[PDB]
Scaffold this active site. Structure first.
Site: not given
Ligand SMILES: [Ca+2]
Ligand SMILES: [Ca+2]
Length: 649
Positions: A286, A432, A436, A475
């Protein structure tokens, strides 16, 4: 055996330690421990939750003061040659009188067959469809009933996995020499956000310790090269925040020097595999780490308002050595940084790589996929633009990253992460910030990682434990027990945020968990999740008294031990960031002393889970009984019965 007046005979609870438990009233009494005709007494006074030195008995026995009525545990430890002892207190739920239980096993274990309570090691013969067993001291009234023919761990299954999640920096410092890589400093305060110095060598030294707990998967914080510097810590900048947790990556192609060498990683993985422990890397796609003064100076990117002699005057020879003065915080250094300068900030990752509200970069979007999470540079995973390497890598000659014809930022990221799998035989990732980054990016990561591991196992047949495929958990913030679209874009299991609150509701009465376990046992017949009591982004589960082990390890699906759950690692200094205390240093002094019997308790329940896939994977039948609480779980040939006598007070 070990005895004291008015306590039952001591029983072994872990090798070389013996315990006795009794509900004691208020008052005072003499305290001597007898082994045959050997007499020992405390030599340095009597306190709770402390290792008490002992002397051969002489004159009047030391007087032990009972300030509170409750279930007291006496412990004697003979692993130092001279006996040391320890005193501890535990001050619409099934009640237990403390006496043996007669269990109807007629539907579970064969007439005339031998059944073991794994916790005590006591074996009973089924007679009239019944067995009678006394729950052992430290069992909390549990019987862990298995066929007596059970001898060793069952074959590993991710749906019965016991994952140990460790922040490597906060576990074991194997080598102090690498603690201050790239000019990193301790803060000389409470070290809330600094590199404590935990490393891969240190972690490797505890593989026997983890194996004894029934751990068969080791999830480590990312060992990849972080931002060298710090940012302001918390809402008030009361501490310097370094990338000790591994979530602020700068170079995916290199190990962070704080974690150790390539050789150290190879030893960790190979020694872990030798003990039947799989390795999971925590991974990020991300975001990269924040801009820091350390990295800005080292790699010649960004812009400062400080020009002329004012620069060296204010920030010094090395800008990262700056400390806040009177009326300043650890956020105050930002006042010197010109985040609006287009030309200066393009020399960082570059416009083709990241979204961020700095200089000439693409602005972050107003959605989960393209937003800048906590002002972190958002990697353009969805971009189809051929990027080349990050601009600032032109001033990073130690990088293993190479420009590859036609590669997008996503192609680089999946290649970089997959190369670690190919080179070391990493068994899986914990992903992680899964919510996103677009699903297609996670699928690409899974496909390449799968190919990479298969290639390693083919090339390393002596080291490969099985031909099992690459495993990936994610997650996705707030994810519960359901087979989401994540499961159709490369995820084998998602982290279950909902178990924590359900465990909390059973903290004062284990039987309260029953409905949660029935639901999870049934739902997870068709898929897997990773449940936890404690995490780095929630809290430390410390309300369970002595019952945290069974609340986690008897859960259906894969379970995650957060390092120090087994030793009740306390919430540490946290400053103005309420999460920082969850990353407190591992409490090794407690492990070898006041938390010793807690660790043994976790080892026993962990070992029971590892012997019985029925726990993680089995259909549950909750038993109907006049006293206590009980269930059966069954998976293929494996069948267990767990009895909980109930509350002893
Ligand atoms: Ca992103
Ligand atoms: Ca170190």
């Amino acid at each position: 055996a070990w005895t004291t007046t008015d306590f039952p005979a001591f029983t072994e609870e872990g090798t070389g330690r013996f315990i006795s438990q009794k509900v004691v009233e208020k008052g005072t009494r003499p305290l001597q421990l007898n082994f045959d005709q050997q007499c020992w007494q405390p030599s340095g006074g009597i306190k709770l939750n402390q290792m008490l030195s002992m002397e051969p008995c002489r004159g009047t026995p030391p007087q032990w003061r009972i300030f509170r009525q409750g279930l007291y545990t006496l412990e004697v430890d003979t692993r130092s040659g001279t006996p040391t002892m320890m005193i501890s207190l535990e001050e619409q739920c099934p009640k237990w009188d403390g006496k043996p239980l007669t269990i109807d096993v007629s539907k579970t274990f064969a007439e005339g067959s031998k059944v073991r309570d794994f916790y005590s090691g006591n074996v009973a013969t089924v007679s009239g469809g019944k067995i009678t067993l006394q729950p052992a001291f430290g069992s909390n009234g549990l019987l862990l009933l298995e066929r007596a023919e059970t001898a060793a761990p069952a074959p590993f299954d991710w749906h019965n996995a016991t994952v140990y999640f460790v922040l490597t920096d906060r576990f074991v410092n194997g080598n102090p020499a690498n603690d201050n890589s790239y000019g990193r400093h301790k803060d000389g305060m409470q070290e809330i956000g600094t590199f404590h110095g935990g490393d891969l060598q240190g972690l490797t030294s505890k593989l026997d310790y983890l194996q004894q707990m029934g751990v068969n998967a080791l999830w480590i914080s990312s060992p990849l090269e972080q931002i060298h510097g710090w940012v302001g810590g918390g809402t008030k900048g009361d501490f310097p925040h370094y990338a000790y947790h591994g979530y602020y990556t700068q170079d995916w192609s290199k190990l962070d020097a704080n974690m150790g060498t390539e050789a150290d990683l190879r030893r960790l993985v190979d020694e872990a595999h030798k003990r039947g422990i799989r390795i999971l890397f925590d991974v990020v796609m991300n975001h990269a780490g924040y801009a820091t003064l350390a990295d800005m100076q080292e790699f010649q990117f960004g812009s400062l308002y400080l020009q002329g002699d004012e620069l060296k005057k204010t920030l010094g020879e090395r800008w990262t050595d700056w400390k806040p003065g009177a009326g300043q915080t650890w956020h105050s250094f930002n006042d010197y940084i010109n985040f609006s300068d287009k030309a200066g900030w393009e020399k960082w990752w570059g416009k083709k790589w990241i979204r961020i509200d700095i200089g000439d970069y693409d602005n972050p979007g107003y959605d989960d996929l393209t937003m800048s999470l906590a002002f972190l540079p958002d990697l353009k995973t969805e971009s189809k633009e051929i990027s080349g390497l990050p601009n600032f890598y032109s001033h990073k000659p130690d990088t293993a990253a190479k420009a590859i014809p036609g590669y997008t930022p996503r192609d680089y990221l999946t290649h970089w992460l997959s190369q670690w799998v190919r080179d070391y035989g990493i068994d899986g990732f914990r992903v992680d910030t899964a919510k996103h980054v677009e699903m297609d990016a996670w699928q690409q990561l899974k496909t390449q990682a799968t190919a990479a591991l298969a290639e390693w196992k083919k090339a390393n047949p002596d080291k490969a434990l099985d031909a099992a495929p690459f495993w990936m958990t994610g997650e996705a913030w707030g994810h519960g027990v359901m087979q989401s679209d994540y499961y159709r874009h490369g995820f084998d299991a998602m982290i279950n945020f909902d178990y924590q609150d359900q465990a909390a509701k059973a903290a004062t009465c284990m039987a309260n968990i029953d409905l949660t376990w029935q639901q999870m046992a049934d739902k997870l017949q068709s898929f897997n999740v990773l449940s936890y009591l404690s995490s780095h982004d929630t809290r430390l589960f410390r309300e369970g008294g002595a019952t945290a082990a069974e609340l986690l390890l008897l859960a259906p699906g894969a379970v995650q031990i957060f390092y120090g759950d087994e030793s009740s690692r306390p919430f540490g200094p946290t400053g103005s960031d309420p999460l920082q205390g969850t990353r407190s240093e591992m409490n090794w002094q407690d492990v070898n002393g006041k938390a010793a019997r807690s660790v043994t308790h976790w080892q026993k329940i962990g070992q029971f889970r590892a012997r019985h896939p029925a726990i993680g994977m089995g259909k549950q039948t909750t038993l109907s009984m006049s006293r206590g609480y009980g269930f059966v779980r069954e998976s293929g040939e494996d069948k267990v019965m767990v009895i909980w006598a109930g509350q002893q007070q």
